[PDB]
Amino acid sequence: LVAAYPIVGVGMEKLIISTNEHASTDQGKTVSRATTNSKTESNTAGVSV
Amino acid sequence: LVAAYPIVGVGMEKLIISTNEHASTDQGKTVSRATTNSKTESNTAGVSV
Numbered sequence: 847l848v849a850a851y852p853i854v855g856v857g858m859e860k861l862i863i864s865t866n867e868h869a870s871t872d873q874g875k876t877v878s879r880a881t882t883n884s885k886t887e888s889n890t891a892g893v894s895v
Numbered sequence: 896l897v898a899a900y901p902i903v904g905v906g907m908e909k910l911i912i913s914t915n916e917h918a919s920t921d922q923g924k925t926v927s928r929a930t931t932n933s934k935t936e937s938n939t940a941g942v943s944v
Binding site: 884892 | 931939
């Protein structure tokens with residue numbers, strides 16, 4: 847009169863989360879050098895009294 | 896009376912980890928050249944006493 851019957855069910859112990867990012871670090875240096883050569887030429891006139 | 900029965904289990908010897916990074920290197924050079932041409936023109940008056 848009694849039935850053969852299994853009854854189950856689950857239960858939570860812990861829960862772990864884990865994010866999604868993308869970190870990045872960059873680092874640089876620089877070195878430079880320049881030269882310059884130039885030439886000017888000018889004139890002047892005038893009158894006073 | 897005794898039962899035919901196998902019993903097993905596993906055991907850890909070593910563990911190896913391996914990371915994930917994306918390294919990068921860059922190297923550059925540069926060359927440049929420029930010219931300049933100009934012209935000015937000025938005037939002057941004045942009075943003294």
